[PDB]
Design a protein around this ligand. Structure first.
Ligand SMILES: [K+]
Ligand SMILES: [K+]
Lengths: 200, 200, 200, 200
């Protein structure tokens, strides 16, 4: 039983590695390993037969579909959901799932505050920069990325073609982003700590 | 009474989308949608007749004004205050408003500490770099942006033309910024959590 | 007695503005305003006659000295200590001073952990990159800045000439920096909140 | 007994300085200082004779080995473990060691969540960008660094050759990284504060 669990974890990790390696530019030996991992996945699934069973289903749907290029890239992407098959073995990942399910309102509030701040500061920086020639931002949607990476403090990069009002707006954006990403997050963190210590 | 609320939210979101799209470079169909959204806004306003009523007023003042380019960009910017019309429907946004109103002293203290740190580290880095040729910063105001994005950890970008003393000042700036943005923020976060859990 | 306080705050702010503006490249009208601010500073000082009196002293020592270029830049820099004359009027800045005085051990521990992490990750990234040609870092001191801005999450900029081991070291540096800047800071924040709420 | 401790701290600091300086491009006077520091290290070790004794051992193994270039760079790197000889004298560093030993599960959970987020967002951004010509990322491993520095908010640099879907994935990556680095860290911080206040 524990040997079967360790085999399952090794097979999931092997499938993740094979995914990532077959995207490498240096590269059957991948398709045979892939079909072996999928044979094990579907054997485990058809022995077992919630969200973990849905994950086990999604873990083989792409392989069985591949037997417009947009749909093809979408399914080759959803082949990455094999990494969530580690949830059945990892207890911290199940705690993270319970936390995400229990703080849905707070995640929505975080996304809402970010949406509002992004629209606000993108409009502000677009209208601050639009008065000049060779404007940095071409539209308000063109500043959405800048606003996201400034509010999250990830950082944009080179802001040299920006003027004084653009930099004033950017300073306000940095401050407001710190605050707005700091307000919902403590509640999610408290939920995680609750579930974690309840488990252990 | 709930269908009217969902229509109001859809109209506010449509006006936000129309704002952002009419700034796009690909672009009457926007002015007719705009005048329809404003007709609904003013109908709701003149049926209703605090800060939310002021927001409802500001949401139509620009449209009615547009019937030096600096004033024009300023009013075309204040057309973005339609996004705060979501406060009447979103409870988290009203909680955020109550939080901001209740932590005014702490917001002022945050801005004050940032002002002091920005002046201090801009002076320090300007005088550290000014001893060389082709100085990175041309004045102490020219380093204000750098100091803001280093204290907020948003990051400046390429700091390669900076010397040893400039980098020592930058290290101190990073540390001091972490601390100063970390001191007022817990109080604002505690106020938000108080109002949020009082509501729910 | 309150008009005198508001005059003092206006004069301190005017001296800060004059400092920052006389560094501008566009620029007696500054030296006369400066000597008026210093006449007021020394009048207030010689009417009054702790750390605030030391600040009042340092606020006029540069003006009275200016009546190798390294010493000159050093004193023209210490002219920035006029911004700490706002401590006598701002209560939050005195709270910040009390906090800094009460968390000296924690500030030293933060600086010590950063020193250790910086030396460690600078050595690691230098020896990871040194095996190649056109190495990004020329010495272990040459990576000190990179390590500081990666541990503080301020960010370095372009890390494209870095290899796989350099990026593994950089990932570890980012994680370890998050942790080490997160460990001492809560104690300083708790001290600040204690002093702040004790005052108010 | 205290003079010997201050000599030991001075010798450790001198060896750290000599390490960092002998990597400088400007540079026996370093090898003689090095052999003196090692003579003191081994004298202290052979007078004393846990993890601190292992550190004292590792602090001289490289010098005694140097009496493929990969092994040589590896040992010249492990010469940096002299900086951990400060643990015997610094109490905060022993507190940090106790904290790291007591929060091993949480450190593993942090690394696990980062691994999962990195694989997820690297796959997502690779498949979002791969539909175009001159793709920014060449493989899913080629986006591992980008995902790490976006989730840690250290920042990547120039993301201009990235498209709309790449920037949507990057926004999600920034948000998810904030959350996942925010969930395990409070427990490690609480452990550190516990050990710190237990000591003092
Ligand atoms: K950051
Ligand atoms: K950053």
């Amino acid at each position: 039983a524990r040997v079967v669990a360790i085999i399952s974890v090794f097979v999931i990790l092997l499938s993740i590695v094979i995914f990532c390696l077959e995207t490498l530019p240096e590269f059957d030996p991948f398709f045979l390993i892939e079909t072996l991992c999928i044979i094990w996945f579907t054997f485990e699934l058809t022995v077992r037969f919630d969200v973990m069973n849905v994950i086990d289903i999604i873990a083989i749907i792409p392989y069985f579909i591949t037997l417009s290029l947009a749909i093809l890239r979408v399914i080759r992407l959803v082949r990455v959901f094999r990494i969530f098959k580690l949830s059945r073995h990892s207890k911290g990942l199940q705690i993270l799932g319970r936390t995400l399910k229990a703080s849905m309102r707070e995640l929505g509030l975080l996304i809402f505050f970010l949406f509002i701040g992004v629209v606000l500061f993108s409009s502000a920086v677009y209208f601050a920069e639009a008065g000049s020639e060779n404007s940095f931002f071409k539209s308000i949607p063109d500043a959405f990325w800048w606003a996201v990476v400034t509010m999250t403090t990830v950082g944009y990069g080179d802001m040299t073609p920006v003027g004084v009002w653009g930099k004033i707006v950017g300073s306000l954006c940095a401050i407001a982003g710190v605050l707005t990403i700091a307000l919902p997050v403590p509640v999610i963190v408290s939920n995680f700590n609750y579930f974690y210590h309840r488990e252990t």
